[PDB]
């Protein structure tokens, strides 16, 4: 049908690639600003749409609405459902003992857990 101004169009949702930094708790108040949420990855074809757009700005790294509310917890998405392996696995990229990488981005064509407060860009979604 239609989307907003500056919104792309795929499959069953508008998107918005936020090229402004913020932390992971600013992207998801802009989102949700929006009358949106931070993205949600269903399934491998929804994958496939972002990674084309991700990996033509991977000096960026793009906040999705995947997180944990502590280290040892589950990746939850924002509406509250589990988080299951069937389009990505989230890589340990942490370098040193650390209790605070527990927000996700994607960035260039994998997804990695970062510390929440950190700037990056984000992607909203609505359905």
């Not at 998801?28 to 700005?57: M, P, V, Y």
């Not at 906040?63 to 989230?90: C, H, K, M, T």
Request: hydrophobic share 30%; charged share 15%; with cysteine.
């Amino acid at each position: 049908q239609s989307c907003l101004p500056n919104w792309i169009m795929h499959g069953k949702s508008c998107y918005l690639f936020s090229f402004s930094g913020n932390s992971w708790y600013g992207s998801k108040r802009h989102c949700s600003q929006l009358g949106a949420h931070l993205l949600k990855i269903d399934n491998s074809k929804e994958f496939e749409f972002i990674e084309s757009q991700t990996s033509s700005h991977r000096i960026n790294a793009f906040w999705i609405g995947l997180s944990r509310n502590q280290s040892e917890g589950p990746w939850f998405w924002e509406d509250g459902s589990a988080f299951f392996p069937n389009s990505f696995q989230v890589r340990n990229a942490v370098p040193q003992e650390s209790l605070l990488h527990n927000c996700v981005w994607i960035h260039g064509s994998e997804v990695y857990n970062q510390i929440c407060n950190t700037s990056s860009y984000s992607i909203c979604e609505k359905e």
